[PDB]
DNA sequence: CAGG
DNA sequence: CCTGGCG
């Protein structure tokens, strides 16, 4: 039994939703939708959106209104969620869901964003450690876990069509890039490098001078498992043709 | 406008 | 470029 998750950072799911997102949804069909950048509280959605046929739902908005916002859609419900690290800073901004199912945790984050000012690149630095300890907190004690969602960097040169112009570009920092290495050596795998070694593979494009249509973008979006769980994945792949934000979906099958 |  | 309070 094959149990499929989807990943898209959404940037305004009232949008997505007038181009099709439904319709979309509806065919793809997995198991566990994950999205992130929202920017929504749930009474302003369409009602349509926050009824799903065969699937609960869940959103963890934002504080800060039309800001931000993650939400999960599953036909199996966890048995429960939390909604931040346990730091009021980081848990207001609805960058955080992780869901317990039983066989894993699931990790629906929306990283924060560098680039806007220093006081935000340190939050995205800090959100990182948080995010971390409380990871390595779960698996420590046994939990396999899931983690997908934005996490606003390019880990390698390969991950950006232009590494050697965005080195002082928050979203490509070598400080960003160190916590991955980091991140990763702490016990977990990028699960798209697990079956993929080819450069051009992107899930964010600027809409500006229409970059999409060029390939030339930046992986931001990305699937993990620690290391004891990477036995279990099964496929991780990029959903390149799907349309309606500047970021792509990505996909996860694993077997239980 | 602010955020990205 | 695209999304999401004026007045």
Same mark, same amino acid.
């Given at each position: 039994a094959v149990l499929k998750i989807i990943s898209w950072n959404v940037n305004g799911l009232r949008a997505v939703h007038r181009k099709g997102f439904l319709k979309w949804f509806m065919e793809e069909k997995p198991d566990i939708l994950c999205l992130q =950048?929202?920017?929504?509280?749930?009474?302003?959605?369409?009602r349509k959106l926050r009824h799903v046929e065969g699937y609960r739902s869940f959103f963890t908005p934002a =504080?800060?209104?039309?800001?931000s916002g993650v939400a999960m859609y599953t036909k199996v419900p966890p048995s429960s969620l939390r909604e931040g690290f346990g730091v009021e800073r980081f848990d207001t901004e609805g960058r955080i869901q992780i869901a317990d199912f039983d066989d894993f945790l699931l990790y629906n984050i929306y990283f924060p964003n560098g680039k806007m000012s220093e006081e935000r690149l340190k939050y995205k630095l800090e959100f990182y450690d948080a995010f971390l300890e409380d990871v390595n907190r779960e698996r420590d004690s046994g939990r396999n876990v899931i983690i997908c969602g934005n996490? %606003?960097?390019?880990?390698? =040169?390969?991950?950006?069509?232009?590494?050697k112009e965005n080195? %002082?570009?928050?979203?490509?920092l070598p400080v960003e890039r160190a916590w991955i290495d980091k991140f990763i050596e702490n016990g977990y795998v990028d699960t798209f490098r697990m079956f993929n070694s080819d450069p051009?593979?992107?899930?964010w494009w600027s809409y500006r001078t229409r970059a999409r249509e060029r390939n030339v973008?930046?992986?931001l979006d990305y699937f993990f498992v620690n290391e004891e769980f990477?036995?279990?994945?099964?496929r991780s792949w990029i959903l390149?043709?799907?349309?309606?934000?500047d970021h792509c979906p990505i996909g996860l099958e694993i077997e239980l």
């Open positions: =950048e929202i920017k929504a509280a749930p009474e302003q959605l369409p =504080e800060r209104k039309g800001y996490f %606003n960097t390019a880990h390698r =040169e390969i991950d950006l069509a232009r590494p080195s %002082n570009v928050s979203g490509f051009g593979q992107y899930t973008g930046w992986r990477k036995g279990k994945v099964k390149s043709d799907v349309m309606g934000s």
